[PDB]
């Protein structure tokens, strides 16, 4: 039997937080806009939108260390954005948004679904707790 490589975390530097599910980072010396895998936040004009933007922003702006983890599948979306799990001092931004009820699990493609179960677990806790998007 042979294996493939285990996902891994690569460092990157904050350029700018964009919105609840998009951050721009300096990655190997070039800017790349990253779309968070497996999540969707409300838009900035919808309810909870500003809160989702602010959450992501604080998390990445406060971080000493930001890391990018690509999944096993597609690395870019149709609009050119990198698709990744983003970590701020070892805490996954994708997961923290879902746990807070500021993102739903969404855009789940089987090619790129490594942390699906971890996020669904977060979503189930946020729904039990009636947070934000689940409050009604």
Ligand X SMILES: Cc1cn([C@H]2C[C@H](OP(=O)(O)O)[C@@H](COP(=O)(O)O)O2)c(=O)[nH]c1=O
Catalytic residues: 35, 43, 81
Euclidean distance between CA atoms 93 and 78, whole angstroms? 22
Instruction: Tell me whether residue 37 or residue 98 sits nearer to ligand X (CB atom).
Output: 37
Q: With CB under 6 A, what is the number of residues at the site for ligand X?
A: 9
Q: Tokens 């951050």 label which residue?
A: 23
- What three-state secondary structure class fits 130? coil
Give the nearest distance from C-beta 136 to ligand X in angstroms. Answer: 22
76 binds ligand X (CB under 6 A): no
Of 12, 23, 25, 37, the one binding ligand X (CB under 6 A) is: 37
4 to each of 7, 72, 79, 115, how far by Cα in Å?
Answer: 9, 9, 28, 17
Buried/exposed 61-89: b ≥16 CB within 10 Å, e otherwise: eebeebbbbbbeeeeeeeeebbbbbbbbe
Of 33, 49, 107, 118, the one binding ligand X (CB under 6 A) is: 107
22 binds ligand X (CB under 6 A): yes
Q: Is 59 left (phi over 0), alpha (psi -120 to 50) or beta?
A: alpha
Give the nearest distance from C-beta 106 to ligand X in angstroms. Answer: 7
40 binds ligand X (CB under 6 A): yes
Give the nearest distance from C-beta 55 to ligand X in angstroms. Answer: 15
Which phi and psi (to 5°) does residue 60 adopt? -80, -35
Instruction: Tell me whether residue 12 or residue 83 sits nearer to ligand X (CB atom).
Output: 83
Tell me which residues touch ligand X (CB under 6 A): 21-22, 35, 37, 40, 77-78, 83, 107
């Amino acid at each position: 039997a042979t294996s493939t490589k285990k996902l891994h975390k690569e460092p990157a530097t904050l350029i700018k937080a964009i919105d609840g599910n998009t951050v721009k980072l300096m990655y190997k010396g070039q800017p790349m806009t990253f779309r968070l895998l497996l999540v969707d936040t409300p838009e900035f004009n919808e309810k909870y939108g500003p809160e989702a933007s602010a959450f992501t922003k604080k998390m990445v702006e406060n971080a000493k260390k930001i890391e990018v983890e690509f999944d096993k599948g597609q690395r870019t979306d149709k609009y050119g954005r990198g698709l990744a799990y983003i970590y701020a001092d070892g805490k996954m931004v994708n997961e923290a948004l879902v746990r807070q009820g500021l993102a739903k699990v969404a855009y789940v493609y089987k090619g790129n679904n490594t942390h699906e179960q971890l996020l669904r677990k977060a979503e189930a806790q946020a729904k039990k707790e009636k947070l934000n998007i689940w409050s009604e």
